[PDB]
Design a protein around this ligand. Structure first.
Ligand SMILES: N=C(N)NCCCNC(=O)[C@@H]1CS[C@H]2CC[C@@H](NS(=O)(=O)Cc3ccccc3)C(=O)N21
Lengths: 5, 30, 105, 147
């Protein structure tokens, strides 16, 4: 769900 | 307590701008 | 759902008695509860994912923001007659001062 | 937050996000009290009934955020943990009494318009403000509904 860091 | 500049937001207290609902907080303190 | 951006909600502190009487859990002095009573007709509550976040107040004397609580537990989220319980930061302040100056910058 | 509204930019510069390294997921909220310390709930790190027991290397701290999902380049700062401190008398067995924990950031974080520490109360501020009826404010990227 979260954008890659 | 807290740090020397603690709790004074760069984008609000420091420019003397108030956020949209802080008045509700201050009005509750009798 | 889960929000797109950070959410905010302003909640009133509730009297200790009203807090003990809404749950079967043993309340201590290191906790305080907050939220609207069913008759107040306003809602709001922290929920899953909000744990550990700050419960803050703005002092009218110096215009600064103080962290009074830490989102702890609740039974459900925004359930009528239920309240959110927060860690009472000031009562645990000596513990906070001590690990800081005994352990660092 | 159930029944809340979207925060304005910079409205809560001390809000920190506890992020798990893998699976990359949001664990909890936290707050910045100085350039090197973050305050959070002990249950975010240790909660045996649910087999939860995180160490420094399992987490990442994301400071200066607005968007839950996005990697906000040039705005947010991500820091690693050096040490985690849980209150010695934290009661997980019964009622989450003394639910508090401090996390030491590996390197001090620089303040900006979006990152700034909150104040910890003193006895007199606590006394005048922690009163029934007085409103406080809570912030988070958590659930919008219980259901
Ligand atoms: N304000 C809210 N409505 N909720 C607070 C944010 C969500 N926090 C939680 O879900 C925490 C994380 S750990 C978990 C332990 C017990 C749980 N509460 S519960 O309904 O089981 C009642 C309970 C309280 C304390 C200890 C044991 C059981 C709870 O709220 N938890």
């Amino acid at each position: 769900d979260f954008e890659e860091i | 307590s807290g740090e020397a500049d603690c709790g004074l937001r760069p984008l609000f207290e420091k420019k003397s701008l108030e956020d949209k609902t802080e008045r509700e907080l201050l009005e509750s303190y009798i | 759902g889960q929000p797109s951006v950070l959410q905010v909600v302003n909640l009133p502190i509730v009297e200790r008695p009203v807090c003990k009487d809404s749950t079967r859990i043993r309340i201590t002095d290191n906790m305080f509860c907050a939220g609207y009573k069913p008759d107040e007709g306003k809602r709001g509550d922290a929920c899953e994912g909000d744990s550990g976040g700050p419960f803050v107040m703005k002092s009218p004397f110096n215009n600064r923001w103080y962290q009074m609580g830490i989102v702890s537990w609740g039974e459900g989220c925004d359930r009528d007659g239920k309240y959110g319980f927060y860690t009472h930061v000031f009562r645990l302040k000596k513990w906070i001062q001590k690990v800081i100056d005994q352990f660092g910058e | 937050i159930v029944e809340g509204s979207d925060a304005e930019i910079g409205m809560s510069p001390w809000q920190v996000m506890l992020f798990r390294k893998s699976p990359q997921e949001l664990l909890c909220g936290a707050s910045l009290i100085s350039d090197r310390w973050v305050l959070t709930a002990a249950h975010c790190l240790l909660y045996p009934p649910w087999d939860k027991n995180f160490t420094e290397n399992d987490l990442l701290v994301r400071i200066g955020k607005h968007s839950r999902t996005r990697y906000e380049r040039n705005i947010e700062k991500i820091s690693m943990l050096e040490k985690i401190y849980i209150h010695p008398r934290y009661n997980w067995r019964e009622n989450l009494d003394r639910d508090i924990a401090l996390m030491k950031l590996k390197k001090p974080v620089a303040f900006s318009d979006y990152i700034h520490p909150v104040c910890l109360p003193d006895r007199e501020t606590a006394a005048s403000l922690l009163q029934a009826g007085y409103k406080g404010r809570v912030t988070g990227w958590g659930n919008l509904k219980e259901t």
